[PDB]
Design a binder for this molecule. Structure first.
Ligand SMILES: CC1=C(/C=C/C(C)=C/C=C/C(C)=C/C=C/C=C(C)/C=C/C=C(C)/C=C/C2=C(C)CCCC2(C)C)C(C)(C)CCC1
Ligand SMILES: CC1=C(/C=C/C(C)=C/C=C/C(C)=C/C=C/C=C(C)/C=C/C=C(C)/C=C/C2=C(C)CCCC2(C)C)C(C)(C)CCC1
Lengths: 221, 220
């Protein structure tokens, strides 16, 4: 349902439209240049480098995102700024390869191996900004320039391998330790994850906004 | 008291010492001999080489009253006592470890109690001195040196103090210590040898202070 910008409840119309689109976005809508969101794969590395906290997350795949409920949308066609507040009921799960070198609460965690983290009841606030741009057809496309993301990660449950590989019970106990510290670790990873999600949100929306014209999405302006 | 001129004397000393081991356990203060089971009041064991830094304090060893003496030799010409002994079953040592090491890829930094059990260990001891005319004309052997050659047998370990800040990781570091303990003990063996040597020197000197060479071994 295209939302007429002149219509009295355009903001509400976009909310409803986007909600409808989430289940279809799961495997992806390749006609609109939108990659799959459940699973959300083919992502950049997550990189955090702080003193006593070096983490790289590679081959990141997130499942569970087609259950997303949209709290709010605002499309401000004066500034070309889309704000979305969304929540996932239940869980999302991320998989990939961790490479960590960290001192966490007195304990050394150096090594590399697979990860699984479940996040229970996460939310996100996203802001996207751009400017309209006349393409060589004369057709006007929105060229997005920035995204910021505010992840509320919720409750983490974690199974992390690769620590003390040289003795299996020590590996098993390091997996256990990782689960206990997971709330705190995720909480301190939040600004890294924020900037990362921002970048992904920028790139994946730009793919949509390249393919579908601003006048086709939002008639009457 | 074994006679030096008696047909067999070397076997008499072996047998003498064998009889004495159970009595030595809590200690024989008439011959100036501290207890051997437990063997306590000992110096620190110290090792610092090759990124492997270990201090063992408050060391106490149990199980030593089951010691079998394989051989004794008392060489009155050089004043040299060589003993070969074995403990059937187990001796166990307890104390405080403070360690800072990388062992087989794993960091072990911390401090806590230790227990280490050795199954069927053995020892070769050599004690050397010279005769000394003591107060009122009895001859006492004044020992000057000792070496010890420990054969540690099969080590098993329960060691606390590593990753204290999460209990399962401490429990797994205790497990890891048991698996590496043969190797660790084998590389500690020169440190342990010099330490035991010192103890054996000090503890025998106390005995050889009190009981004269002529009383122990008549007719020489
Ligand atoms: C669908 C969609 C949407 C939405 C979305 C969302 C809502 C998202 C989210 C997202 C999220 C919410 C995310 C998150 C993530 C995270 C992660 C992935 C992380 C990771 C982590 C880890 C892995 C960790 C680890 C560790 C530990 C725990 C311990 C220590 C060690 C270590 C470091 C290893 C929207 C509206 C836009 C529209 C369109 C479509
Ligand atoms: C009775 C007697 C005798 C003998 C004796 C003997 C036979 C002895 C023995 C002894 C011995 C044979 C000893 C041993 C000892 C040892 C030790 C004391 C050890 C220790 C160890 C440890 C404690 C360790 C630890 C650890 C580990 C294991 C791992 C890593 C970490 C650590 C390093 C912590 C005679 C005849 C001379 C006479 C007099 C009396």
């Amino acid at each position: 349902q295209t939302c007429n910008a002149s219509s009295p409840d355009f903001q509400l119309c976009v909310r409803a439209s986007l909600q409808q689109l989430i289940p279809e976005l799961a495997s992806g809508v390749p006609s609109i240049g939108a990659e799959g969101v459940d699973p959300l794969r083919g992502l950049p590395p997550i990189v955090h480098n702080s003193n006593g906290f070096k983490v790289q997350l590679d081959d990141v795949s997130i499942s569970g995102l087609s259950a997303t409920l949209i709290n709010d949308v605002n499309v401000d066609l004066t500034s070309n700024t889309i704000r979305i507040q969304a929540t996932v009921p239940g869980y999302i799960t991320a998989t990939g390869i961790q490479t960590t070198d960290a001192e966490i609460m007195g304990i050394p965690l150096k090594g590399s191996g697979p990860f699984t983290i479940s996040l229970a009841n996460p939310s996100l606030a996203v802001t996207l900004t751009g400017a309209p741009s006349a393409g060589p057809n004369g057709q006007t496309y929105l060229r997005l320039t920035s995204a910021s993301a505010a992840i509320e990660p919720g409750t983490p449950t974690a199974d992390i391998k690769g620590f003390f590989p040289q003795f299996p019970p020590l590996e098993a106990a390091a997996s256990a330790f990782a689960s206990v510290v997971a709330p705190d670790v995720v909480q301190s990873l939040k600004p890294t994850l924020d900037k990362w999600l921002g970048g992904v949100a920028l790139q994946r929306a730009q793919a949509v906004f390249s393919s579908v014209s601003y006048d086709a999405l939002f008639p009457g302006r």
